[model samples]
Target: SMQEEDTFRELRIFLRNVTHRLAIDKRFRVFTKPVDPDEVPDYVTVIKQPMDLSSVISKIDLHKYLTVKDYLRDIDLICSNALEYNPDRDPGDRLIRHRACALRDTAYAIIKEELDEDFEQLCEEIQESR
Candidate 1:
């Protein structure tokens, strides 16, 4: 129980720091909420599991994310899912995809800042837990 408490605190701080940064940015506005299946009827069919920044925060609050790896994947999903759904064709479509790609890069850039040494340390913690 003591160890569990310590582990949770690490995840919470890591999640809080990164998510707080992303949550405050205007660029990530559209990514903060879950995709509306009603609006994008084919979303579910393409992305079996849709992830969003808000849901990621919900999971962090619930302690659903056990490791940094898990948290990172969900963050990636939010960006990647957008890339998947939007057609990257020429004209305006390229703009949409370009933005999505930009968002993905931006997200990882933020994460990488926190991730560098901390991520490796967390990986060690995970390995120890196992």
Candidate 2:
């Protein structure tokens, strides 16, 4: 469907923008390979499909992983934007809802796949600010 395709495209753009911002903040090192601003689409090609947990889990450094966890926490904001009610907004505009769901679901899937018991303890330790 055209709407589904458009939703996915928008999601990809959103992912690219997030990565670009992270890059600018020097938080992009979370990834195994660095991203080039001009080649963002190629660099973030996995959003189109399910990325293997192994590919990402092994490469996440502490600094960048914490940054990304914070970023993931913000998906609640995106979900709110999609589901918020506004009389002035278009009633038929549902793409944002789909986009939010896709983002959250994908994030959960990836994290659950990779964040094993030891990784959970590591994350807790990281959060302790030692």
Candidate 3:
């Protein structure tokens, strides 16, 4: 059964746009790949679900996302996971949470201004076609 009513066009574009926007940002660029657990032995134990931009890019190519919301969950996790793992107490901690927060803000800004409006039309179209 094939259904072309979902209208994933805008959603995929938004995902790629956000990924590109953040990929070039200095604050967010370093987090584009998975954190090496060997660098932080307890990282996996602390972060139950590790996420990063590279994973998102792969997910997009692999068609792992169904909706914009699903894509955003992974985007938010990329920061939240870091915020949880990196705190401001230890000397080794170098404001990772601060950088993560900034990255989160940058991603949300794009979604709020562009994706929401674009998706609303798609949503209406899908419902009408249904």
Candidate 4:
């Protein structure tokens, strides 16, 4: 129990630092897959759990994003981030994974609207990459 408490404390501190980092950025690429030099900031939100320090962010909503960006490139970024940081076992890694997944999901759902495509491909990419 004591160790768990320590883990939580450490995670919270890490998250706070991440928040501060995001705020200071004039811009962030948001994805590493295929590495886009032009990923712009549309919106940012940090989903933070105080106890475990598990956090993720949602941005540009699926519909809005679909109207304007390269869907696959973003997905690649998501997968890349997860491979670099497996969120399942580490709190720090979870934060990046969370963000990547959120973006990928948004892209998938929007694409499915017209193609009748299963968004599972994104999920599969995430699983395979991680």
Best by TM-score: 3
The top-ranked prediction according to lDDT is 3
Pairs with steric clashes in candidate 1: none
Of candidates 4 and 2, the better by lDDT: 2
TM-score of 2: 0.40
2 or 3, which is superior by TM-score?
3
Top-down TM-score ranking: 3, 1, 2, 4
Clash count in backbone of candidate 3? 0
Query: How well does candidate 2 score on lDDT at residue 39?
Result: 55
RMSD of each: 2.6, 16.5, 3.3, 18.5
Cα lDDT computed for each candidate against the true fold: 0.74, 0.41, 0.76, 0.38
* True-vs-predicted CA distance for residue 69, candidate 2, Å: 5.0
Candidate 2: minimum summed lDDT over ten consecutive residues — where? 50-59
Cα lDDT of model 1 overall? 0.74
Which ten contiguous residues of candidate 3 have the minimum total lDDT? 1-10
Q: Tens digits of per-residue lDDT for model 3 on 1-130? A: 1344335655666688889889889878658889998877988888999999999988976767757667778988988888788766775455677778888888888778876665656655654565
Off by over 4 Å in 4: 1-29, 32-74, 86-88, 114-130
- Candidate 1 lDDT, tens digit per residue, 1-130? 5766786677678788788777777766767788787977878888878987789888999977777777878877876777777765766556656655666677678767656666557655765776
